[PDB]
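Board work, copied verbatim: Ubiquitin-protein ligase E3A
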Amino acid sequence: GPSRNLDFQALEETTEYDGGYTRDSVLIREFWEIVHSFTDEQKRLFLQFTTGTDRAPVGGLGKLKMIIAKNGPDTERLPTSHTAFNVLLLPEYSSKEKLKERLLKAITYAKGFGML
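↓ predict structure ↓
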């Protein structure tokens, strides 16, 4: 909708972390920059892949629970997620580009839940 940058912060507020990492961590922190920095259409397909839903609605995203899990050490693997359980499985990459490229392809390749 006509606005300056989508309010994905609410989503971040309820976003969960696994293993031994947090939001301040390079993996999550860099990850968030990529999602927020993406265009509106990119965000829409991004959310469908991870949780089977559309980009940030006029309301807050904090109403939905998001789960972040680390696949493993910095290695080249295709990112995976489940809309049914709203879980994101991404390996801990050493660079935002490294995870951005793998992540972007995974969400674009996969078909979003959509509607109707």
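The longest helix spans residues 96-109.
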